[PDB]
Amino acid sequence: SMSVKKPKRDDSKDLALCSMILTEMETHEDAWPFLLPVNLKLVPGYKKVIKKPMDFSTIREKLSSGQYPNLETFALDVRLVFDNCETFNEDDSDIGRAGHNMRKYFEKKWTDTFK
Numbered sequence: 001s002m003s004v005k006k007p008k009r010d011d012s013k014d015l016a017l018c019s020m021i022l023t024e025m026e027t028h029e030d031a032w033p034f035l036l037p038v039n040l041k042l043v044p045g046y047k048k049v050i051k052k053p054m055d056f057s058t059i060r061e062k063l064s065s066g067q068y069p070n071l072e073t074f075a076l077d078v079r080l081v082f083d084n085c086e087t088f089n090e091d092d093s094d095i096g097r098a099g100h101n102m103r104k105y106f107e108k109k110w111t112d113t114f115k
Contacts, residue, residue, distance in 0.1 A: 021106070021113060024105075035056050035057060038053055038055070046088065
């Protein structure tokens with residue numbers, strides 16, 4: 001509360017470490033559904049159904065331009081990518097499986113890096 005602060009968790013490396021994680025996600029073989037924004041002109045249903053589209057390129061631009069105020073807002077966008085994928089794709093599809101694998105991959109790096 002006022003003039004009463006918990007000890008300062010060192011956040012000075014968070015930008016670098018989120019950038020490293022994102023590089024690892026970008027280079028995973030199963031990243032291909034997620035690298036670019038879904039083309040809203042060419043994919044029926046996407047625009048109406050997926051209220052907040054997100055992709056790795058968009059997260060990378062946000063990261064590079066100071067649009068994440070902290071590491072939790074970064075993790076929210078990454079998870080959004082996988083949550084969107086589960087909304088739109090059957091679990092037993094190549095893209096559905098890709099999304100599960102990537103989420104697993106991400107959550108491990110996240111825990112190992114920060115928790």
